[PDB]
Amino acid sequence: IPHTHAHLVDAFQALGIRAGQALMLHASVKAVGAVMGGPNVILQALMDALTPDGTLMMYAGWQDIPDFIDSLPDALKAVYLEQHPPFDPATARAVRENSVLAEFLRTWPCVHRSANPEASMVAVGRQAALLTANHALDYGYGVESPLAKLVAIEGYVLMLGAPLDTITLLHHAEYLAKMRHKNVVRYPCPILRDGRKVWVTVEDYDTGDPHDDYSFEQIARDYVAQGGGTRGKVGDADAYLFAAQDLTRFAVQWLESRFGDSASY
Amino acid sequence: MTDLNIPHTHAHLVDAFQALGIRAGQALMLHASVKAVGAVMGGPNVILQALMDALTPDGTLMMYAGWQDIPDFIDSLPDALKAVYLEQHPPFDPATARAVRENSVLAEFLRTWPCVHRSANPEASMVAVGRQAALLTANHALDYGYGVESPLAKLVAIEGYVLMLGAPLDTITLLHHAEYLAKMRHKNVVRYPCPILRDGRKVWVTVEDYDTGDPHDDYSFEQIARDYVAQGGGTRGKVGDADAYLFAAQDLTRFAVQWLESRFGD
Ligand SMILES: NC[C@@H]1O[C@H](O[C@H]2[C@@H](O)[C@H](O[C@@H]3[C@@H](O)[C@H](N)C[C@H](N)[C@H]3O[C@H]3O[C@H](CN)[C@@H](O)[C@H](O)[C@H]3N)O[C@@H]2CO)[C@H](N)[C@@H](O)[C@@H]1O
Ligand SMILES: [Cl-]
Ligand SMILES: [Cl-]
Known part of the structure; x- marks a missing residue:
C-alpha cells in the first residue's frame, strides 16, 4: 500500500513542519x-502542511550548463558558442542528481525560478517571488542569493532521504566564513539578455570541491551530534529538519575555528 | 561496442527535419x-526547439501524454484498499499530471513550454504547442477518448502528420482512432473510475471507452504499420542517430481502417 497524501502530511507535521514556514527541500x-x-504527491503533501502562506524552494541549477567549453578542442568550442542554447528559466532542465522533485516543481502553477x-532555485508559495528575485550572476550562493533570503526570513532546510552532503545552504556558509583561502572560479555561460543570447563570464567560489580539509557531511553530522535540528521518518525515508539561521551560524563558526587565518595583513 | 558521437546541434536537427519533409505550418504529432x-x-529540449523551428510559429506540435498515475485499476482491489484510493488519490490536474512512462521525455518537456495546451x-490526454494547439486540444470528451471528439480526429480533419523519431511503429496513438472508426466483428467496451477536477474540487467519474490496452481481435499495431510502410506509406530519413518516419495522418488512418475492416469487418 503506497504512502497516502494524508500519511505524508502527518509525517511532515510530526517532524516539525508548520503552517507559514519557508522551506528548502532536498529529497x-x-x-x-x-x-x-506518484512523486508529485510528496510536494502536494508538503505544501498542504505549509499551507498557501508557506513557501517551498528547491535547488534546480541547469543540467545543460556549458561551463566546460574551454576544455574542448577549439573547433568544438566554436560550435558550442554558435549552437548551444542559452539558459531559459522557463525550460532549462534541473540538474539530474536528486532532483526528480525539482523537475516536478517546475510544472506547478505560479512557480518562480531565479536567474x-x-x-538557479525554484520556489512556490507566499514568499516564492521574494526568495527567487534578483539572484546575482556572480557569487550565486552569497549575499544576493535565495539562500541569504532564506536565512533572513528564518526559513528551514528539509532533508527527505537526501544525503547530508547535498545541503546547498552550506555553500552560503562557505561564502560567509572568514577562511584562510577560498578558490575562485570564472567560467563562461550563455544567458538571455533583452531576448537575445549573450555569453558572459560568471565569477563564483568553487562549489565542486571544498576550500579546505572538510566535507559538508562532516559539518552536518557534527551539527546533528550537538543537538541541531529534528529527525524523523517520512514514508520510508530518514528525514532531518534544520533551521536555516542556526545551521548557517553553526557552519560558519565550524569553518572559522578550523580554517581561519589568524594572521593580520 | 559503439561510442557516442559529438552532440547534434539545433541547426543540424532543423536541416534533418527539413530533409525528411517537415514544412512550415504543418500540424504534427510526434512519437520519439x-x-x-x-x-x-x-539536451532533449533542443529536439523540440529544432522541430518547432522547422514548423515555425504557424505550425503545431502535439504529443500523447496520458496520465501515468491514473487509478483506473481500483475496481480490482480489495474493498478496504479501494476506499483508501477513493479518498486519498489525487485527481487528474492537467498542469501537474505526469505523462506516461515510456518514450515520453519530450512530452514531459513540452509541459514546461510556455503556451502549451493540454486536453481534458x-x-x-494530449499536449500541444503552436498555431492550432488550442483547436486540437479543445473539447476532448471523457468518453471514447480516441474517437470522434478527440485530438486525433481533429489531427486527421486538418490533414496533419505523424512523425516517428526512433519510436516503434506499434506506439502510434492514432491507430486507436482507427480502431474506433473501424466496423469490426468484436469490440471490448470498458468502464473505469477516474478522479478529475470539477470546479477546482476532486470528483470521481466513470469513463467509458473502447479498451486500448489490448487489441479487439487477432492483430497488432506493429503489423498494421509495417504493412503500411511496405506499401509505400510515408517518407523516411535520419534525424540525429534515429531512423525517422513521416506519415500523413489522414492516409494512415484510412489505410488502418481498411486493414481492420478487410480482416475483421462487415
Ligand atoms: N495486456 C494486459 C492489459 O494491459 C493493460 O495496461 C495497458 C495500458 O495501461 C496501456 O495501454 C495504453 C493505453 O492505456 C493508452 N490509452 C494508449 C496506448 N497506446 C496503450 O499502449 C499500449 O498499446 C500500444 C499498442 N498496442 C503498445 O505499443 C504499448 O506498448 C502499450 N503500452 O499499457 C498497458 C499494456 O498495453 C491493462 N493492465 C489491462 O487492460 C490488461 O491487463
Ligand atoms: Cl530524486
Ligand atoms: Cl524518450
Missing part, C-alpha cells in the same frame, strides 16, 4: 518509497 | 525515443 524520491499518486543559471 | 536520437547539444481527457 530522494526512491528513499521515500512508493506514494499513492542565476548554475545556482 | 530521445535515446535513439543520440546526444544533443543542449485524463487517460487520452
Whole structure:
C-alpha cells in the first residue's frame, strides 16, 4: 500500500513542519518509497502542511550548463558558442542528481525560478517571488542569493532521504566564513539578455570541491551530534529538519575555528 | 561496442527535419525515443526547439501524454484498499499530471513550454504547442477518448502528420482512432473510475471507452504499420542517430481502417 497524501502530511507535521514556514527541500524520491499518486504527491503533501502562506524552494541549477567549453578542442568550442542554447528559466532542465522533485516543481502553477543559471532555485508559495528575485550572476550562493533570503526570513532546510552532503545552504556558509583561502572560479555561460543570447563570464567560489580539509557531511553530522535540528521518518525515508539561521551560524563558526587565518595583513 | 558521437546541434536537427519533409505550418504529432536520437547539444529540449523551428510559429506540435498515475485499476482491489484510493488519490490536474512512462521525455518537456495546451481527457490526454494547439486540444470528451471528439480526429480533419523519431511503429496513438472508426466483428467496451477536477474540487467519474490496452481481435499495431510502410506509406530519413518516419495522418488512418475492416469487418 503506497504512502497516502494524508500519511505524508502527518509525517511532515510530526517532524516539525508548520503552517507559514519557508522551506528548502532536498529529497530522494526512491528513499521515500512508493506514494499513492506518484512523486508529485510528496510536494502536494508538503505544501498542504505549509499551507498557501508557506513557501517551498528547491535547488534546480541547469543540467545543460556549458561551463566546460574551454576544455574542448577549439573547433568544438566554436560550435558550442554558435549552437548551444542559452539558459531559459522557463525550460532549462534541473540538474539530474536528486532532483526528480525539482523537475516536478517546475510544472506547478505560479512557480518562480531565479536567474542565476548554475545556482538557479525554484520556489512556490507566499514568499516564492521574494526568495527567487534578483539572484546575482556572480557569487550565486552569497549575499544576493535565495539562500541569504532564506536565512533572513528564518526559513528551514528539509532533508527527505537526501544525503547530508547535498545541503546547498552550506555553500552560503562557505561564502560567509572568514577562511584562510577560498578558490575562485570564472567560467563562461550563455544567458538571455533583452531576448537575445549573450555569453558572459560568471565569477563564483568553487562549489565542486571544498576550500579546505572538510566535507559538508562532516559539518552536518557534527551539527546533528550537538543537538541541531529534528529527525524523523517520512514514508520510508530518514528525514532531518534544520533551521536555516542556526545551521548557517553553526557552519560558519565550524569553518572559522578550523580554517581561519589568524594572521593580520 | 559503439561510442557516442559529438552532440547534434539545433541547426543540424532543423536541416534533418527539413530533409525528411517537415514544412512550415504543418500540424504534427510526434512519437520519439530521445535515446535513439543520440546526444544533443543542449539536451532533449533542443529536439523540440529544432522541430518547432522547422514548423515555425504557424505550425503545431502535439504529443500523447496520458496520465501515468491514473487509478483506473481500483475496481480490482480489495474493498478496504479501494476506499483508501477513493479518498486519498489525487485527481487528474492537467498542469501537474505526469505523462506516461515510456518514450515520453519530450512530452514531459513540452509541459514546461510556455503556451502549451493540454486536453481534458485524463487517460487520452494530449499536449500541444503552436498555431492550432488550442483547436486540437479543445473539447476532448471523457468518453471514447480516441474517437470522434478527440485530438486525433481533429489531427486527421486538418490533414496533419505523424512523425516517428526512433519510436516503434506499434506506439502510434492514432491507430486507436482507427480502431474506433473501424466496423469490426468484436469490440471490448470498458468502464473505469477516474478522479478529475470539477470546479477546482476532486470528483470521481466513470469513463467509458473502447479498451486500448489490448487489441479487439487477432492483430497488432506493429503489423498494421509495417504493412503500411511496405506499401509505400510515408517518407523516411535520419534525424540525429534515429531512423525517422513521416506519415500523413489522414492516409494512415484510412489505410488502418481498411486493414481492420478487410480482416475483421462487415
Ligand atoms: N495486456 C494486459 C492489459 O494491459 C493493460 O495496461 C495497458 C495500458 O495501461 C496501456 O495501454 C495504453 C493505453 O492505456 C493508452 N490509452 C494508449 C496506448 N497506446 C496503450 O499502449 C499500449 O498499446 C500500444 C499498442 N498496442 C503498445 O505499443 C504499448 O506498448 C502499450 N503500452 O499499457 C498497458 C499494456 O498495453 C491493462 N493492465 C489491462 O487492460 C490488461 O491487463
Ligand atoms: Cl530524486
Ligand atoms: Cl524518450
